[PDB]
């Protein structure tokens, strides 16, 4: 059984190929949509269902932390809520009122801001 290529829909006869996204590909049919590099071996990210390499992602495909306003590395974990996301860091995801870290705590969101408790939301008007 030769593995089938999910891009060009034909079999791979080379003895080298790439596995990504649960699928097989000719080396040259899994490539950064932005800079065209061969993704094989390398870290990549699915943005709008096209694979991009790590530096293209960092350079034009965002995810900017609501707390510190810096990009969140696509390799590390992050906290999301609705359209928002924060580094999983005591500096980014904490209480707007009292600074209490909220990673894995109960919290209360109000647009961007985020609080540990009703009390804390009730200060901050």
């Amino acid at each position: 059984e030769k593995p089938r290529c999910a891009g060009c829909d034909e079999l791979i006869f080379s003895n080298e190929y790439t596995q990504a996204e649960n699928q097989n590909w000719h080396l040259k049919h899994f490539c950064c949509f932005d800079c065209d590099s061969i993704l094989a071996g390398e870290i990549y990210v699915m943005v709008n269902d096209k694979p991009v390499c790590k530096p293209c992602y960092v350079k034009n495909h965002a995810v900017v932390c609501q707390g510190c306003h810096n990009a969140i590395d696509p390799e590390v974990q992050r906290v999301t809520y609705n359209n928002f996301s924060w580094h999983a860091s005591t500096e980014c995801f904490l209480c707007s009122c009292c600074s209490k870290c909220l990673i894995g705590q109960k919290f209360m969101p109000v647009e961007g801001m985020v609080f540990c408790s009703v009390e804390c939301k009730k200060r901050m008007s």
Binding site: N15, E16, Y44, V45, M46, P74
Partner: peptide, 22 residues
Amino acid sequence: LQTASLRDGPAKRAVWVRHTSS
């Protein structure tokens, strides 16, 4: 009130399937 859930980064690795030489 709700709970903070760590989600994983969207990055993955493209596995380079290739045999080892003699």
